[PDB]
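Reminder to self: keep the SMILES exactly as supplied, no canonicalising. Ligand is magnesium ion.
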Amino acid sequence: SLSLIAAHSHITGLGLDENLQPRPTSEGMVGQLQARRAAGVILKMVQNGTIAGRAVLVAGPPSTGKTALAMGVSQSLGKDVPFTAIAGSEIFSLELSKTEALTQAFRKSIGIKIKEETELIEGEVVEIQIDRSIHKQGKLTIKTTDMETIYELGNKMIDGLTKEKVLAGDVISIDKASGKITKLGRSVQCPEGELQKRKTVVHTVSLHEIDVINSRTQGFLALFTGDTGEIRSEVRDQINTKVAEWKEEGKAEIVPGVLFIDEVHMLDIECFSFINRALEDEFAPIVMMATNRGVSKTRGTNYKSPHGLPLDLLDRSIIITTKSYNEQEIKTILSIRAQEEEVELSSDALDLLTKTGVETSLRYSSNLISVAQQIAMKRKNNTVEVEDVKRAYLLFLDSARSVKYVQENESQYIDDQGNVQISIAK
Amino acid sequence: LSLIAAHSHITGLGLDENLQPRPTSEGMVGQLQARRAAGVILKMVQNGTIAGRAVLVAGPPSTGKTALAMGVSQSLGKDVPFTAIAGSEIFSLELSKTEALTQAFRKSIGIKIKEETELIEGEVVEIQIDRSITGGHKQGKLTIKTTDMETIYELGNKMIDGLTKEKVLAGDVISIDKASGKITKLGRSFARSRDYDAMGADTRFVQCPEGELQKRKTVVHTVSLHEIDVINSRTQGFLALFTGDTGEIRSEVRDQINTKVAEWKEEGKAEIVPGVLFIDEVHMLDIECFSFINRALEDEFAPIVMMATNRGVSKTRGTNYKSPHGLPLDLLDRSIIITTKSYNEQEIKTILSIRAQEEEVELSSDALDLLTKTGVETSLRYSSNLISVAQQIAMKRKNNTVEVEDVKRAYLLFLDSARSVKYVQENESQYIDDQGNVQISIA
Amino acid sequence: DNELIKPLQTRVLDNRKIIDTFAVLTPSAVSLDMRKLALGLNDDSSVGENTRLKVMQNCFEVSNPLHQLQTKLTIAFPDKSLLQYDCGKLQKLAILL
Amino acid sequence: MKALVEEIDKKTYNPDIYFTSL
Amino acid sequence: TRTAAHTHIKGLGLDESGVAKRVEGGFVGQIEAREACGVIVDLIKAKKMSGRAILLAGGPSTGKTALALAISQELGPKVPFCPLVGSELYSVEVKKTETLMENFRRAIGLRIKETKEVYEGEVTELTPEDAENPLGGYGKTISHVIVGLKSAKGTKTLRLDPTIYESIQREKVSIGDVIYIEANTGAVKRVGRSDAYATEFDLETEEYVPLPKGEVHKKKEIVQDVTLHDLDVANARPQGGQDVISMMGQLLKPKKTEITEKLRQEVNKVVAKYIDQGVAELIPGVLFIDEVNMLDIEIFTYLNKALESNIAPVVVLASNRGMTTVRGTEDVISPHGVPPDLIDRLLIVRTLPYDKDEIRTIIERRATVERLQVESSALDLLATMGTETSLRYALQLLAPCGILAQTSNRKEIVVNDVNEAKLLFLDAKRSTKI
Amino acid sequence: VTRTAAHTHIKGLGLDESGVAKRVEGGFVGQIEAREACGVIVDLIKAKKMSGRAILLAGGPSTGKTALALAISQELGPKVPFCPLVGSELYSVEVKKTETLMENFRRAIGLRIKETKEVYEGEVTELTPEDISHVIVGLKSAKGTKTLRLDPTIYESIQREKVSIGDVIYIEANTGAVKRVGRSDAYATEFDLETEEYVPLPKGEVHKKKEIVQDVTLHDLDVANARPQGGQDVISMMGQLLKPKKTEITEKLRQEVNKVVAKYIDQGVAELIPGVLFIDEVNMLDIEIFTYLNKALESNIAPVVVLASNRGMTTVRGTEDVISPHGVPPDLIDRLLIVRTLPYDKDEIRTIIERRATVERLQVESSALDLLATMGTETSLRYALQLLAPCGILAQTSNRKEIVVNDVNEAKLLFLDAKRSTKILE
Amino acid sequence: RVGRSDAYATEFDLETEEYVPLPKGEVHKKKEIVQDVTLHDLDVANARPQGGQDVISMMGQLLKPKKTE
Ligand SMILES: Nc1ncnc2c1ncn2[C@@H]1O[C@H](COP(=O)(O)OP(=O)(O)OP(O)(O)=S)[C@@H](O)[C@H]1O
Ligand SMILES: Nc1ncnc2c1ncn2[C@@H]1O[C@H](COP(=O)(O)OP(=O)(O)OP(O)(O)=S)[C@@H](O)[C@H]1O
Ligand SMILES: Nc1ncnc2c1ncn2[C@@H]1O[C@H](COP(=O)(O)OP(=O)(O)O)[C@@H](O)[C@H]1O
Ligand SMILES: Nc1ncnc2c1ncn2[C@@H]1O[C@H](COP(=O)(O)OP(=O)(O)O)[C@@H](O)[C@H]1O
Ligand SMILES: [Mg+2]
Ligand SMILES: [Mg+2]
Ligand SMILES: [Mg+2]
Ligand SMILES: [Mg+2]
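Structure tokens returned for the bound complex:
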């Protein structure tokens, strides 16, 4: 998975010990002790899997670590467990109702593991002999590290091998039941033992994936095209009852996951009303909601609310609150960011960055590191010194300074009333 | 296919060789400053170098702004695209506002690709097609003649099929395109030997062609940039050229078409003829449309946009603040505004006379004076509409000229805005008010 | 009415020259297996074998007027005029001949 | 994935026999 | 037998080189409006102008829709009249502008007059005459094919050109078949066997048609009426068949689409060509948009642009409003509902309210239309209510009075029935009080 | 000969090696600080390290923001993908605004790949169906002959191209495209008149193999893997005329495409070229677009999005009580670095007018140019810029090449400014 | 076609056949089948029937099942 550097690449975990007590700086996370402790409690609840339909609200001031906390929870939760992260603005679609979009998001975060035991023969082919009707007579020889035997083919196997046009001397894989043939290069690699092996393959799917697969004749393309449409509720009921029966039979297990809505303050009252009931039912994942606004008017309503959310939903949620950082934590977060971005800052440069971040914003100081690095490279210098950061500060403006400039020159910008003085004279 | 319309009386801007507007020429009267500015914009379009300029035509109603646009279009003539749209046309259901504006902008740029084709023309002497029954082999030869030469061609299968489909005979003068393969029956050289059916349906003889049998001719294919975009957007885009439902063409298609057309121009294969886009009542457009117009005028493949507005200061749609012309200051900063003024009595009189000439209505002098006084009093368009009704009233009287009494009757029968407003105010109880109340009974 | 009314098919057929001249662009990326995977005509689809073969045969026998557009938008060949454009000797040889 | 174009020799190629060896 | 609200409006009732008669054509009163509609009808019949707008302005129950219907009846069924309510423009499949343009081009009409010569009759003889070969070669050549057709009081033999053999083979005609051969085209078409051979076989799938009447050679003039909208839709629609485009058209339901200007211009060009050839004539027609107050400002602006089109019909608008705000605008109070820009481009005709005598005459003529008989006292009371509450109230109350009279075994409407209906059915005012 | 647009004179940022900007280079006059900042941004983009970085070009109208964006595009070069946009372009009707934004995000990320093309071409000497059946075709060339076996799809393509014996074809093995290039020259004189256009017999061997490097975007791969896109078979025609409209591509398809691209890069057959997404007039965006832009920037594979606005203390569209520095909510502002753009004095206006006149092939007298500069100072710079073409037209009509003061006065009397038109309205 | 009998499982050592056991009970078994279906199920079945093996039928099957009035 090759990709560039993001703003959350350094957070490789939640940084807890055995007793769920977070360390001062571990797994890329700094500070936020109580928030990380509560996030570890949530993570343990997710791993247990015995608790369903819990909503946790991650509230606090901006640039405090809500998305960082969610990313740490996701990484510590690891793979092999669903984690759906959708912004609140992704629900509003022209093809799916908001309730249907929320339902699909809810189903995406509940995983189902199905084990399929397949009999497949793997080895290095040697000879193939196919003859005309005397329907068809055929013999193939497969060599491995310790066996070399011939196989008497039948009609359909001969047809399949002719369709694949398998050559000789190339590693081949044939499935006894399905009949699929997977080609491989000449034996770096080599056959490793018995001709016919018994290895199980596990398929990880979500409830939404099963719903879409059964939705149409070839619905599994919609998982990529996105033209699923509002699935009939009877189909979902069928999926649910069959998943219950499979779990009872023991031929499939359920892996509950986490659904993360980053900007819940954009969902309307209908979405919250739907969420209230969707949480109650079984197969409901754990919903993490991140909000920042203190008291705002819920979208679709004309009244204020304690977080931009209706009181019914807040009654159903437990709130994890994040607190603003101080100078030392800003310093160590910037050091981690600089190490991630492969930038060697000096001590005085780091101190200047820390004071700038405390005065203005942590994100502003975080973004200045790469610009400072590029400025230094223009001077053919390796380490970023104070003057490079000062030039970066002079060239690029923050929110407060930009606001001050706009306020002091309000005539030359377009205002809310649509007035501007383009003419430099008069 | 046309009828006598409102602006059917103007055939151009009526300018001299030095762009000085004549007092009355090509149908236009007065508006000397406006006509001079329109001529300057005309020369700018004809030069083909200046790209993406915006020009605004402002003034009171009935001051001739749409007439000015029609004059510019007529001076442009054919071969120079002119896209006349209204502000209401952008708001569609299958396309976005930005997409509709993009398609309207691209409709005004034409691409001409010239090709040289070989054409065979002559009068047939003998046609002979030999085909075996229950067999696929066909063999045929024809003798096509001209006044100075005659020759025989032995034909391939496709030519035989085409001539059989076209129903070519001996007394036929036909043309053959060696590349396309189409056969066009130009006419007949003599009669069909007096068979029973089709006795005398070939009397309209045509002269035998003269000269070299196989002559080269040039063919010009003119297609707008939007048509190329629609063709290359999808495989079914060709149907979308007529049906509509073009969809929102991906930006990569437009960028690639731009690059390919620039390469064609640098290669001399294609000639680009930019045109004019004209928006009626641009005040109906949203602020998003104005922002897109602001940006899209900076493109190198953009036409010259001209807009008409009469709102004065008014609220821009999509915003809650009034703007100088119903348009944001960003769009006003990058547009040159040409203004129109109210008309004198003499200008109104001569416009009425021009309209009467176009409508083939013969007005007496006193009738024309009364119409001019009415138009000054009420409206130019009111008298223009009254002319034809007066002609019909005169015809009812069995008279070939419109007199004062016919105009008086037309005035009595048909009302102006002011008289209707007065009659409404006097009898307000007989009409439904904004509060939804009306008296139906008379007692 | 056969001349006043012309369906889309005869318009596709009659505008052959314009289609040849102006259809230039080709897709940036294609995947051949998606052509049959979209219709459920792959060899290992859930549709029955007999239905798949019948649909394939009907597709083989059906006639489409958009074939020229498909072949123009699938592969692009440089125009013959490019040969003249790239050699002034050929340019003057053309008028000489 | 699959080779849509295959090279065959008229004398050698025949559907009745398929053979390949080291 | 059915009775709508305007069955009695047969026309404007004007006289040649004159004025409106007081009562004629189902109209009572409204002399000025009828004369104005007459001059407008003359203008439409002139067929030389485009984009002419008239506005029927007046109160409720003033005859506006009756005037529009009178214009339609006076012009005749040959002139394309397109009734419409302003509410109909707001579609869900396309924009309002497209719907307005479609109505505009539906109002314009085209008439195609074609004369065709045809020979029809039962095939009796089929013999090719041998002739000398210009190219020799000892082959057997034919110079003509002889077809003998017999008809009712007529029979002839034709020496057609040798080309007919292809059409004869394609149409698999035979002796006893009755065929249809075009004189100038050379094609043939069989419509069935002759009825004289229906007895030769007890069962046969083919349809035996009666022998055609008249002489074998018949000249017929076929007139067909089309509208520009019909041509545009036909050109924008696939032919329909076994080709793949028609198959996907069957799969996807045909929604309305923005027919491009290129297709419309092509239709105009072909129409102009055939008009110049002398086979087609253009009829402008009338587009009647009732309740123009319902239209939004965007539709009004597009009307402003479309009235200037070189080919456009005569648009008649009707509004019962006074000073009301134009829909889609917040502070545009205009006369009627029409914004001032469009009012400057139209001509207004007033529709006056009625007097007691006019209401009484309208009521009695409507009662005559509904095949009802009323006493004089009952008619006077009905007119009193009509002047007291509404004309349409009494006009509608006529029928329940008739039903009550019929239930009482009476063939005439009496004051008792009128009062019984008055008590049973309340008007708007008495119900508002209740 | 050549056409002129708003930014035809802008050839680059005009920055030297050290990074300092000359007063007049690359068609730019003044704006030194913004040019230096944009040069630093260009260096950052060329580094190809960070993802999701965003900057804001903040200034009044007619100040040089779009010119700076086009200069950045010129400096980066045609290799990199630079996607221009307007805030009004994201309000689609087929798919939601979020999908359009994501598609434009992935359109600005470039990929350069190497592909080997297998090509066959020659004169057909045999067309024998194997019996929907394979076709055995024999291709002859000037250097040799070859006999091939083609799949049924290629047979359908050949069948619908009306290819017979003696025709010359062109089969591309990778894509299965068949083009009938014409009839062989050996049969040119068979008939004196037929529609066939003849071509010479191909030179070289029938089987040709070439290696071409082609530039694609991630959006191209997503579209390829989402919907069928080409082909000469009726199956492809039905597949693409079915589901024609745009679809809401899912995150799963993007993740799988990213995995494919990572595999391609790891094998060395592909290289990545991150680019720039330019969104002009960002104030037209609604609050939902900004909210999703917050999440989209945190993606590990994102371009360097540049935003431009000319508004100050304007309320954000969609919201009713959020006053923001440039119409951009504070949540996004913290993610951005603001480059302030400053107005122009009289001398720089004069130089800009001079250079614009030089570009459009006009001759302006010094006194007339001074009058044009002073009227641009009085009314507007763009107003002075658009007056040049009418002045040149007026001068040409008087048989005079150089522009004089009288022509400028006449052009002023003909065409008016916003202030003069508003005064006339008053 | 349920599949191949387990009796012929070892006829070929490599063959793609879903071998299934011999059915239990008699060859001719009569069973009474009871199902609970809503009326909406019948309405959906009538509105969007799954029958037909034509090209049009299959193409309609591939289309998304949009709700209709
Ligand atoms: N002058 C008239 N002579 C005879 N019947 C008339 C006359 N005017 C109206 N009517 C009839 O009165 C009834 C109502 O008049 P209409 O013209 O249909 O309605 P209206 O006057 O257009 O008012 P609106 O706009 O529809 S609410 C209809 O049955 C008409 O036929
Ligand atoms: N410093 C400069 N040097 C040279 N030309 C310039 C300069 N600044 C602006 N221009 C040109 O003058 C015009 C000003 O347009 P822009 O540069 O787009 O200004 P702007 O900031 O984009 O205004 P908005 O926000 O688009 S209304 C363009 O034609 C530019 O090419
Ligand atoms: N506790 C933390 N440890 C490490 N980095 C952090 C922490 N909190 C915030 N950050 C960094 O700050 C940046 C912005 O934080 P973000 O997730 O946007 O918080 P919010 O969503 O509340 O604004 C991120 O790039 C992240 O790397
Ligand atoms: N300068 C003019 N010369 C000739 N005719 C004119 C002139 N100005 C207006 N007219 C006529 O008067 C009418 C005014 O129409 P229009 O130009 O649409 O008014 P507006 O300028 O309000 O749009 C047109 O029918 C036009 O023929
Ligand atoms: Mg966040
Ligand atoms: Mg106008
Ligand atoms: Mg009415
Ligand atoms: Mg800009």
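Points to follow up:
DSSP finds 14 helices and 16 strands in chain B.
The two ends of chain B are 54 Å apart (CA to CA).
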